[PDB]
Structures are given as structure tokens and as C-alpha cells.
Symmetry: T
Subunit: 161 residues, 12 copies
């Protein structure tokens, strides 16, 4: 006749502090990447300026969408993101982007290593995230895939023969 549950209060999945911290690690590197990507996008100069200028904006869009995805996933699982400038600066694992104008070739190298660093954070955190919540790991897979594609589209400028 009926299979209906009877509780008036059914709780949702709550992330462990460890899991929250792991997604926080991903968050700050994604925001930092976005900030560095815009810096590069503004200040890149030299041969093949336009392509890099445009590709860098694609990277920024992806990293911004990613940071919102991770922060919102945290919220869904009762964890609390911190994307404030001071926290991002204090805790990001990305090497800092240099000041002033940079050459196209230099920007290609710099941004590639910074995407690599961002992806490394996600891969380092992956197995612990997957173990607690496979659905979140799928979002991580999307980030890895999208970011490694950006790294290919950007780095290929400097690859010879």
C-alpha cells in the first residue's frame, strides 16, 4: 500500500571538517588563478598578443565558474567557504604572478605553471574528497578536465616542433 517515510525532519549530508578544508584549498587556488589570469590578460604584450589576451579571459571565466561551483558545493554540505582577498593571499599555493608587463612567451610559461599548480591542488585533494563524497569528486573531475584543456591551449604557443 505505502512506502512513505514518517519523519518530519530528515537531515542532509554534512561534510566533515577535513572535507570542508579540502574544498577550501581548491577554492583559494581557483580564485588566485582567476586573479592572476586577469593580471596576465591585462599586461601581456608582444607577438601573438591577441590570442593570449582572449584565451586568458576564457581561463578566467572557467576558474570563476569553478570557484563558485566549489564554494556552493561547500554550502550545500554545510561547510563555509572563505574567498576573501586576505585569505586567498595568505593560503594560496600558486607562485605569485610578477608585476608589470610581461612578454607573450613569459605569460605562456607563467600561466601554464599556475594552472598546473591549481590542478595539482585538486589532484592532491581528490582521493580524500572521493572517499567521503563521490558526487563532489565529479565536480573535481570537471575542473581537472577544463583546466588541463586551458593549459594545453595556452602552453602550445611555446612548444617547438
Amino acid at each position: 500500500m505505502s512506502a512513505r517515510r514518517t519523519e518530519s525532519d530528515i537531515q542532509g549530508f554534512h561534510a566533515t571538517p577535513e572535507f570542508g578544508g579540502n574544498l577550501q584549498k581548491v577554492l583559494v587556488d581557483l580564485i588566485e588563478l582567476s586573479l592572476q589570469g586577469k593580471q596576465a590578460h591585462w599586461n601581456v604584450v608582444g607577438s601573438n598578443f591577441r590570442d593570449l589576451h582572449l584565451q586568458l579571459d576564457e581561463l578566467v571565466d572557467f576558474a570563476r565558474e569553478g570557484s563558485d561551483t566549489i564554494a556552493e558545493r561547500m554550502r550545500a554540505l554545510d561547510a563555509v567557504p572563505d574567498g576573501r582577498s586576505d585569505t586567498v593571499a595568505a593560503t594560496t599555493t600558486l607562485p605569485e604572478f610578477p608585476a608589470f608587463e610581461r612578454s607573450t612567451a613569459d605569460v605562456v610559461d607563467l600561466i601554464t605553471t599556475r594552472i598546473n599548480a591549481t590542478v595539482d591542488t585538486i589532484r592532491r585533494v581528490h582521493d580524500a574528497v572521493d572517499a567521503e563524497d563521490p558526487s563532489t569528486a565529479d565536480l573535481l573531475h570537471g575542473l581537472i578536465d577544463g583546466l588541463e584543456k586551458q593549459a594545453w591551449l595556452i602552453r602550445s604557443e611555446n612548444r617547438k616542433v
Copy 2:
């Protein structure tokens, strides 16, 4: 050439697998129906936001039920989304009739989303073991519905 030889069959789901997807399906349809009920009948403070959010929940739940039912079809299982079956087999607590306050609707719908996510989380490991590709569809459902739960329940949060 590496070309194979002329009637290669598709992956077919075990009865148990079909049954697990059936469990997900009825709770998604029930959620969709309950969501529309809430959408129409919610009243009170912050009516508009709740009215609108609930329609988005319904869209997701309907897309989800279609995704699951069609995955069943692809793997040679047979969905049953009929009204009697859904009423008879859904695990979701019954949604009340009549007008309900926004605060009560927030609480009620959060419970019923969580019930739906619970079903998907309950079958996840057994479907993943048999067909990882289907578990990915389940992950999208878990992610999307848990997002909806957060967006809805935050209205009632204290500090």
C-alpha cells in the same frame, strides 16, 4: 584490419539494477509533484522567491526523472512512472494539502529533497559497482538536489 565480426548486444542491467533506478525514479516524480503542489499553495513572507525557487526544483526533478527513466530504457530496464505506482512506492513523506506558509514550505520541501537524495545515496554504491556511467548521472542528481536544498533551507536559517 582490426574490424570485428554482426549482432553485438548492448550492456543490460541486472533486475536489481533496474529496481534501484526504479526506486530513484519514483522519488524524483513524487518530488516534482510535491514541488508543484508547494509552488501553487505557498503563501506569506517572501512568497515570490519561494514560488520561483520551487519551480526550478521541479524543472530539475523532471529533467532528472527523464534522465533516469531513459537510462533504464538504454540498459533494457522498464520504468514505471504511473500515478498509482508513484503513490504506492515513493519513500517521500506525504506533502500536505491546502495553503502552507513559506516557513512551513521551506521545512517541508527541504525534508522531501533530503529524502530524495537519501534514496540516491542509498542505491549509489550498488549501481556504481555494476555501471560507473550510471553513477555519474546519480552524482549530477545528488549535486543538483543538494544545491536546491541549500537554496531553499537558507531562508529559515537563524544566524
Copy 3:
């Protein structure tokens, strides 16, 4: 100021219990139709599968919009809809949809019959609705027109001439 009314409270048109009842009847058959339409959509097999599979989704879209229209018209007029599964199952006039895979020929006949049953409810209810509120009768005309079109587009498959 010349022709302005001075009432603080000007109340809206309220549906009678009979009117609310009449729209409730339309609502449950529209929802049942949507549920059966999807069942048929998923489970139809055989000759001209795709055309039928697609047409059934178009039927479902129309019935879903129809049920939302009806229910919101109820709300506008201070009536209260009930589209919950138990209610729809217990009160719909539509013949039950059979279980399992069904042939395209079978689905055509089954769905045509279910559409006609839905239209019949709207037609039975029409005059009482029109008498109380002509504006709602127009929404009923939209439903009659749209559903009878669906019936034609579906039934024509099985017509032998």
C-alpha cells in the same frame, strides 16, 4: 480625483466551491495525462518509434503547462489545487495506462483514448465554468483546442484509408 473610488479594501473575484471543484477535476486529469504521456514516451517501441516518442513529449509539455495554468487560475480565484500523486491516482477519470513496453500502434490507441477522456472532462465542466467566469472558460478553450490537436496528430498514425 473626480471618478476615484475611496475604499481601502477592494476584494477580488472569489470562485464558488462548485467552480473550484470543476477546475480540480480538470487539474487531476491533466496531471494524470502528463504522467501517462511520459510513461508512453519512455516505453513505446516498434515502427515509427521516434515520431511517437517526440510527439508524446510535446503532449506532455502541453499538459504540464495546462495543469499549471489551471492550478494558478484556481489560486487567482482563491481556490486551492491538489496535484499530489495519491489525489491524482484516486480521482482521475482516465483509464489506467498499462505497464511494460507497448507497441507504437498500441500507444497511439491508448494515448488517443486518454487525451479524449481529458478533453471530455473539460467539455463536461465547460458550461458551469463559463456561466460563473467567462475568462476561465477561455483557458478551457485553449486546453480543448491544444489537446484535440494532439489527439489528431497522434491518432493519424493508425488511420487506414
Copy 4:
């Protein structure tokens, strides 16, 4: 050539002075509603500001399209609309909208009353319009349906249940 008429001049349906008058009444209340809707849109403050601010614009859009529909229906039938400010102020049936910032709770009650007044004009006029020209009565049904929906979506904010 067999069933073709041979008249050089075939004139169209012309509204009677009464019909023109009846549509004029609908027109001024629709325009007044749009003006009050915008006033409320700009000046509403307090709890749930944004929802109300947005809904009021949706109301205004519907009332503006409504007034254009009515006025052009008049023109089609050789009647002449008057939507000028002095005329609208001197002949509208709507209670005056108050000046200054108003709370969201106040705006809900005020605007619900103004919508209902507008609908009341259309409802009072309906039968005389329907008797002369059923096609125009259908446009009135669109207005009744659309405005009563607006009233429901707005008033529900203040409902305590």
C-alpha cells in the same frame, strides 16, 4: 468568380458610442494602474524589497501591453482612445496612490486594491462588450486572467496562515 462579391466598398465593423465608452473606461484604469505600478516600483522599501520591486515591473509591463491592446482595439473598430494624463487623472476609478516611500507590506495591500479596482472595471463592462463584440470580450478575458494572476502573486506576500 463564382461566389465573389462585386462591391467596391466593403466597410468594417464599427463600435457603437457605448462600446467605445466601455473600452475607454478600461483604458484609463489600465494606464492609471501602470502609473501607480511604477510609483510603487520606485518607492517601495523594506522587507522583501527586491521581489516586490521586480513583480511591480511585471505588473506594469502587463498593464502597458493591456492599454495598447485596448486602445488599438478601439482604433480597429473606429473608436478613439484618450490616454492623456489629464483624462486619466480625471476619469480613473482607482484610489489615488499615496506619495513618498511606502513599506513592502503597505505596497502589497495598496497595489492589490488597485489591481482589483482595474479588474472590477473590466468585469462591470464585460457583458455589454461581449453582447456587441465577442472578439473584444476575449481580449478582456486576457486582461482579467493576467491581472488577477498579478493580484495573487502580489497579495500572497501579506497572507498569514
Copy 5:
């Protein structure tokens, strides 16, 4: 199961021969109007050519959608349309469109007359249609409203005031 009907065959509403005949009359005049509209569209010359050239296409679009609506309403109700050239020529009530280039002033008067003739057919037929099937009468109201609007937008060109 409680209120479910148990009939294998539930048939739809079937138009009487009179109803089918009445919609046939509307159909041929709509098609004739589309054909004359295009003729006028191509062959109009003189002052304010472009405005007229464009408006005539808008008229044609509406009449084409109208004829499709009518014919499909016939099909829905088990009636059979005939929109073939010989039938339209032999049975239309519209005065014949003249050959050759025609002035913008001439086209305005000619097309206004043809529109009015088309509307007259719908108006003559309306009550018999409404009596049998109110839902179809609503489609007629759409046509009356849309065509009379077209007539206004076209005739206003020649109005001297």
C-alpha cells in the same frame, strides 16, 4: 482506480457537416486573402511604397497562420479542408484582385475591402460555430481581432483628416 473510466475506446468531438462547411468558408477566404496580399505586396508602386510593401507581408503572414489554424481545427474535429487553387478561386467571397501594377492609394482601398470581406465571412459564421463549439469560436475571435487590426493599419494611410 476509484474514478477511472474503463472504456477501451473513448472517441473525440466530431464536427457536424454544417460546422465543417462553416470552417471551409473561413478557410477559402483566408487563403484567397493571402494570395491577394502577396499580389498586392509584389505589385504595389508609388508614394509610401515600402510601408505598404512591408504591411502587406505582415497581413499575408497572419492570413497564412490563420488558414493553417482553421484547417487544422477542421482536422482535429474530423472535418476535411480543401485549400486547393481551383476550390479557392471557385468558392471565395472576396472581390477579385486586379492585374498589373497598382498605386499605393489603390492598394490601400482594395486590400481594406478584401480584409473586410474576410472578416465578414468569419462574423457571419461566428454564432453557428460558437453554438456548436465555443473553443473554435475563440480561434475565430483571434482572426477577427488580428484582421481588423491589419485593416486599421492599412486603411489609415488613405484617411484625410
Copy 6:
């Protein structure tokens, strides 16, 4: 400067050229009317595909008739697309009244498309000789209609 001197006339078509375009025009309008007739009245196996395809044929034929009529206007010819003229001068076999089966509609409409293409192919060389630019418009019509014929007739093909 290479600037010319103030009333340079446009290319004007011979009466014969206008007449040839008139021939194309009436068969395109007739096809459009016959296509709609078929669209409404077709019934039976694979109704939906045929119903939909026929509407695409009508769209093409209507766009085509407008293209030809306006080319006539551009070259100072005067189209006649009126109902009596079309009925009196079309080369297309009459389409039957009443409901027709999908199989019969496929055969009937294929014949009438082919008749329309035949007209365009019949006048092609004489229009090309006078105005190559107009023959390009004819080529688009031949291509598009012959595509329609293939898409429609394939339904009835044996093996």
C-alpha cells in the same frame, strides 16, 4: 575622375523572359497550395514525418515564389500569382481532395515536385541566355526542390 554622367536605366527583361518566370511562379504557388493540402489531409503509417516534411516543402516553395516574383519586379516584369491565374495556368497535375494515405501522398507530392522542377528545367536555358543572375535563382530552386523530392520519395523505396 572616371565618373559617369544622370538617368541610367536598369536591365529590363524581354516579354518572353517575364513569361518564363511567370511559368515558374504559378507552379511554385500551386506546389505550395498542394503541399498545404497534403500537410493537412495526409493520414496513416508515418503520419508525423510526412506532415512535418510537407510543411518544409511549403516553406521552400513560398520563399521560392516570392524570390521569382520579386526578380520579375526588379527586371520590370509583372507577376500574376492570383488564384484564378494559378488554377488556369499551372502545369501541375491536380492534387486530390479528402484524406490520403502517407504512401499515396509520397507518390502524389513527388510527382508534383518533379512537375515543378520540370518547368524550371524547361525555361532554364532561355533565362540563362538572357540573364545568368536569374538562372542562379533557378538553380537554388532546382537544388532545393529536388532535395525535397528525395526526402519525400525515400519513404516509399523498396530496397
Copy 7:
């Protein structure tokens, strides 16, 4: 760090500034209402162009009135766009009732656009002196409306 210390207020307009924006607002609303009146009731030679152009004028004037009213709100002023206020305080010459010829509508509407632009030009320097950002909004209004005046009045031009 250069971070400030927790209740920094927004720029607030003087009463005079609010009043000047109020002046612009009522003339924009009046223009919108007059434009629709003209749009409906214009008849005669070149009806369609005028009918259509007048609707574009109305769109601009409505967008403009919303821009001004919301700028008032942002700067803590309170708009009054009510029918009585607009009728009582607009500087625009009354638009006549009844059908008017296209030639008369061109002249009438040009005058009333110019009246509206005149108001904005009259308050410009006093608003610019207080808040340059608001004067930019006024510039868009001057530009757009003067464009409308040109597009409308050109119909009546002699040689």
C-alpha cells in the same frame, strides 16, 4: 593595510537637485503618454512610419523616466510620477484628443520633444555642478530625444 573603518553613507542629493530631477521626470512621463496618444490616433499619408517611430519615442521616454526616477532613489530623493502630479506640473503643451493627421502629429510631437529637451537643458548645469554622474544620464536623454525629434520632423521638411 589601507582598509577603512563601518557605516559609510551614500551621496545624498540636495532638495533642489531632487526637485530638478522631478522636473525632468514629469516631462518624460508626459511625453510617453502623449507619444502613445499620437501613436494610436495618427492617420493619413505615411501613417505606418509615424505609427512605428512614435512607439520608439515612447520606449525611449519610458526607459528615460525609469532611469531618472531610479537615480533619484539612489541619491535618496523621492520621485512622483502619479497621474495628477504629471498633469499638474508638466511643462509640455497639451496634446490634442481625437484623430490627427500625420503632418499635424509630426509638428505637435516635435514641439513636445523639444519642450522635454528644453527642461533637461534648463536643469543640466545645476545638476552637473552637484553630481557630474547624473548629468551624463541627462546627456543620454538629450542625445536620444534630439535624435527622435530629427527622425520625426524630417517628414515635414520642405527641400
Copy 8:
């Protein structure tokens, strides 16, 4: 096995005369675009709006056409010249008059200039067709599109 073995295969090169023929088309299309904008701005009088709008449509077609011609030239390794001095010095179009012009006058002036542009395309047609039929198809699009514009514009002044 059917594969050609040459490492570099050359594409079709246009003769310089062919390039010169397309160049004639180009300058007249650019001149027409420039005159069309002049007319679009400066037209006044009865039925102003229709003409103002129709003139912009002409300009859009003419600008798209000149891009099509110049890019066809580049495809075949010809080199277009669309610079102002070249256009002014080599266009065959009668000069457009200065100042405001009535809609009636603009209709006649622009019809003539469209007809002049079309005439250039028609004059080079056979020489272009003989060398490269694909390019002649682009000429056909231009003839068709421009003669349509001529009809749409001149119809305003037709008294029947």
C-alpha cells in the same frame, strides 16, 4: 594509391586582368556605400523614415558585397585597393550632391547610382565568367541583390 605525391600543390591564380576587373566592381561598391550613407543622413521630406531605413539596408548589402569582392581577390592572390583617393579617382558613379535632398530626389539619385554599380558588374561579367565561373556566381548575387534594392527604392517615385 590515388594520393598525389607532390609536397606543394599550387592553387588557382587569377590573371592580373581578372584582378583588375574585380577592382572595378570593388570601387563602385565602396562608392555606392559611401553615397548611400550620405543619402541616409541627408534625406528629408515625405516618407523620410522608409527611405532612411531602406538606404541603410542598401549600405549593408553594398558593404558586404565589397568585402566579398575584396576577399575573393585575396583568395586568388589579387590585391584590392579600397582607399578613399583610389575610390574617388576611379569610381564610375556620378557624384552624389551635397546638402539636404528631398526623398523624391534621393530616390532618383540613388536608383541611378545602384544602376551604375550594376552596370559595372554586368560589363565585367563575361570576362570574369570565362576565367572563373565561381567568381561569376558572386557577381550574380550582387546583380540580384542590387537590382532588388533599385526596385525597392525607385518604386516610391513610380506613378501608375
Copy 9:
């Protein structure tokens, strides 16, 4: 302070075996796209139009898939080969027959070829997943999308 100090950080490199696994997927997706177009053109008979259209949808999914796989390979510094000779020489799909084929025959032929393509993805899945779970997620999308196409197509021939 948490910032890494190395000037160049290396990204994830796929093993050559991983690249080889994705390569198997790629050739079958390309072969499937090519056979799908062959079927789309040459299908005739009852319910022609639905099949003609469904086959193009399959081709779109298969083309998008092969781009996804080839670009994932490039991301991980593998090097795809989608050239005709390689596809023909290394595809595991049964050859599609020449000439016109009936809708019934096309349904069965294409179902088999979709099933063959899916089988390749399923065969390499675990080896791909073990090295790079993110890539396995792309494999899942392909399995899901292709098996849907198989269902949508084969249903035409199902007799119940």
C-alpha cells in the same frame, strides 16, 4: 607563505599506454561518425525521415565525442591519430555495407556499430580510470550518450 616557490611546476603526464587506450576510443568514434553519415545518406524505405534525422544526431554526438577524446589526449600530452588510413586500419567496427539500405537493415547495422563503439570504451574503462578518474568521467558521458542513441535507434525494430 603557502605559495610554492618553483618557477616551473609540471602538469600531469599520461603514460603512453593511457594515450594508446584513448586512441582506441578515438578511431572507433571517428569510424562511427563516418558510418553514421553513410547510413544517413543511403537509408531508404518506411520511416526514412526519422532515421535520416536520428542518424545525424548520432553523428553529431560521435563527432563531439572524438573531439573530446582527442583534446583530452592533447591535454595530457598524448598525440591522437584520426587520419583515414589509421581509422580504416585500426577500427574494431564491422564495415558498413555499400549502396542503399532499408531502414530496418540500417537500424540493425547501426545499433551493432554503436554497441561495438561502446564496447571499446567499456574495455579500456578500468585502465583509464586507474590512471586518471577525470578521463573516465568523459568515458562515462560517451557510454551514456551512445547507449541512449542505441536505444533510440533499435526501438524502431522492436516487436512487442
Copy 10:
């Protein structure tokens, strides 16, 4: 004849002080975007959804603004710095608090931060306007757009 004969004509160069003024605007716009996202994620309580949505609209306007300012700097050969350390070290905005915050608190906090950002633009306005009026027009768009956001947000807490 009116043509200038110099082979290279220099564009307008911004003084370094001008660049510095735009830099102040930039860091506050970026800080505002970052705080806006923080608020957007962490806001809870009555009327959550409206605020959640309005905060994203603010973030979109602020991100577009910072791009506009940074690109205006580049146009005039100034060099922006939008890096996290620089933003944190040089923003004039009060720090946004950690953790979940109520909708009422978020309304007041964000209004203040919008007002701080606007104040920076208003402070540099006259110095920017004196050197380059075109840039001051961009400042006006920002003032107008941000003060609108301030009104739309703070209205939630207004008790009348």
C-alpha cells in the same frame, strides 16, 4: 592635402599620477567583487534568495567595472595591478567578516562596502577629469551603477 605627413603619430599618454588614481579605483572594485561573492555564498536567513541573486548582480557589475578600469589604464599605457596581495594590502574597503551572516547584516555590510568603493571613485574624480574627461565618463558609469546597487540592496533594511 589636409593629410598629416608624420610616419608615427603618438597617442595620448596618461601621467603616472593618473595611472595611480585609476589603480585606487581598480583595487576597490576587485575587493568589492571578492567580498560580494563571499556575501553571496555565506548569506542566510529571511529573504535569502533575493539577496543571493542581488549580490551576484553586484559582483557582475564590479567585475565588468574592474575590467573597464584596467583596460582604460592599458589604453593609456598605465599598468594595472589586480593581484591578491596588492588588493589586500591597498584596498580601502573594511574587511568582510568570516562565516555565515544574516541577510539583515549582509545588507548593511555590503551597502557600506559599495559606499566605500563609490567614495574612492568620487575622491579621484576631479583629478581624473582634469587630465582626461573621457575616463571621467567611465567613472560616472561606475558611480551610477554602484549607487543603484547600494539603493537596491539597502532598501531591504529600510523601515518606513
Copy 11:
């Protein structure tokens, strides 16, 4: 009175075997070009990577649309295309694309010559195609025009001074 033809069976234009073979020649080179274009698009590396990467996808889109156009034209004229991988490999006239990564400059040269080869096929076949069916030659003109434009947009990267 009537100009209507009387045959119940009117056949369509049927291509000669020679014509079918000529379009088949065009088909395989278009498919081969598409395959090579994607290979280049994936494997291009070096200065100005992105522009070439993107342009190559434009070329692929055009060649794919072209192959479908030619194959469908064949079908319209009762000819039977063969676009299978074995046939394409066995019969294409394009020099094969090399394996592995290639430099931007190398890809520009390689793809230019392969477009040149594809266009050469169409030009070689042109006159015989035109003689039998001028409408098909027009499709060939589109292919020539579109492909030679691609060749210009791609080759210009390597052109100096």
C-alpha cells in the same frame, strides 16, 4: 481553361554514371580534407597556435557541410555516395597528412596544399558537371569559393612582406 499535366507518374532528373563518379571524386576529397583538418587542429603546436587551431576548425566545418551537400545532391539525382573510411583512404587524391605534432608553419603549408588539392578536384570535374547539370555546378562554385577563402585565411600566416 486548364494547363494541367495528366501523368500520374512524372520522373525526376537522373544523373549519368559519369556524373555520379565525378561527385564521388569531390566527396572523398572533402571527407579526407575534414579528417586531415581535424588532425592538424589537434596536433598543431608553436607560434600562433590558437589562431591556426581555430581557423582549422572553421575549415573542418566547411568541408563537413560540403561533403553533406555533395552526398545529398548525389542522392537527389539517384546516385549513391560512398564516404566510408576504406573508400576515402583508397581513393582520395590528397597527399596524406603526416603523423604526430607539427609546427604552425608546417601545418600552414601542409593544409594549404591539401585545400589546393581538394579545390583542384572540383575544378577538374567542374565542366563535365556543369554540362550535365548547371544547378550542381553552382554548389561546386560555393565549395571552390569557400575553400579558396579558407586557403587564403590559413596560408597568409606564412606569406612574407
Copy 12:
């Protein structure tokens, strides 16, 4: 009671001859820039061809929209533009664009200086324009901003380190 003005004739703002001449100066340089931009767009050859080819079209679009804006502003203020080829050639201040193909690096330098020259015209004219009509100066600000952005996006190709 009433604040309505009483004149039946209210004139619009009329530009001085000087102001008209100033906007004319802006106009011819914008048209010249558009003409040169297309010349460069067609004839640019070499490393990073595609980016420049595309960016040049963006510049052309902006300069075309600008020329229409200025000419229409002139018309609004009763001034009469001259954008004819002879006038543009006789009066533009831009150095002429060279003939034949030019290298990417050369085009970057050439176009940058020509944008610089166009902007210089607008800046030279600015204060006199602003003094008479601040609203027109705002349009000039848009042109300056948009053109200087183009100059940055184009020139950055040639900027080293």
C-alpha cells in the same frame, strides 16, 4: 493647477557653423579610418595574420558606428554632414595608407598611428564641442575610449618585453 507651456512652436537646439565644422572634422577622419581599416584587413600578411585580420574588422565596425553617430548628431542639431569619397580624401588628416600587401608588423604600426591621428582630431575639437553642447562631448568621450582601446589591442602585437 497647470504648468503647461503655451507655444505651438518650440524650436530645437541649433549648432553654430563652427560646431558643425568641428563634428565634420571628426566625421571624415572616422570614415577615412574605416576605409584604411578595411584596406589593412584585406592586405595584411605574415606572422599572426588572423588576429590582426579579425581585430581590424572590430576597429572598422567601431569607426563605422562612430561615423554614423557623429553624422546623425550633426543632423539632430541642424548641421549637414559630408561623408562623400572626394571630401573624405580632400580633407582627412590621416596619413594615407600605403598600397599593396603589408606585413603584420607594418600594419600594426600604420593602423596604430592612424587611430592616434583620429583620436587627436577628436581631442583637438573636444573643448569647443563641450563648451557649446556637453551631450555631444559625451559621444566624443565614447569615441576616444573605444578607439584608444582598439589602439591598445592592435599596437600590443609590436610591443617588446
